């Protein structure tokens, strides 16, 4: 019956970590000089002495940083409606209440594939040849593990939909 419920807000509960753990961890490139190897993130980079921070803001640096608080903002309001989604709250008929989660962690979704197209799309392109230790490192990664927990956070609640109507 209700395990979508119990099944796709732990999608979520996952998911909304690895966004999380994806704009506090310096580590979406690997790249090293002399004696400092390190990292680089969307906000603070990293060395070996000290740290660094940004300098220029970056068109899909100032693109990534928004869409992914944007994922975020509509990922923290589903699992609020998770929450939402077992209590029943006599309220309208418009958007159901076991639904309206299926939109918007499909809008987080949307937002985080996005956000790391715009990462990839530019990085290659605006550099290759001059940067030799082009690598997407394990905060990437985990930007992509994150795409397909809320993806199916959205899947579960949508097919609990039909089965609660129909």
């Known amino acids: 019956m209700y395990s979508f419920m119990g099944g796709g807000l732990f999608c979520a509960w996952v998911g909304t970590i690895l966004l999380v753990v994806a704009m506090a961890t310096d580590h979406w490139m690997q790249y090293r000089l002399s004696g400092s190897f390190a990292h680089q993130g969307l906000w603070r980079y990293c060395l070996g002495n000290k740290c660094y921070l940004q300098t220029d803001?970056?068109?899909?640096?100032?693109?990534?940083?928004?869409?992914?608080?944007?994922?975020?903002?509509?990922?923290?309001?589903g699992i609020i409606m998770g929450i939402m989604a077992f209590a029943h709250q006599p309220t309208f008929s418009r958007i159901?209440?076991?639904?309206?989660?299926g939109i918007m962690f499909f809008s987080?979704?949307?937002?985080?594939?996005?956000?790391?197209?715009?990462?990839?799309?530019?990085?290659?392109?605006f550099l290759g040849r001059r940067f030799?230790?082009?690598?997407?490192?394990?905060?990437?990664?985990?930007?992509?593990?994150?795409?397909?927990?809320?993806?199916?956070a959205g899947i579960f609640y949508m097919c609990a939909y039909r089965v609660h109507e129909c």
């Open 96 to 101: 159901s209440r076991p639904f309206s989660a």
């Open 57 to 77: 803001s970056i068109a899909y640096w100032n693109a990534t940083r928004a869409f992914m608080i944007l994922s975020a903002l509509c990922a923290i309001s």
């Open 132 to 152: 030799g230790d082009w690598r997407f490192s394990w905060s990437y990664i985990l930007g992509w593990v994150a795409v397909l927990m809320t993806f199916f």
């Open 108 to 125: 987080s979704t949307l937002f985080v594939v996005l956000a790391l197209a715009i990462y990839t799309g530019v990085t290659v392109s």
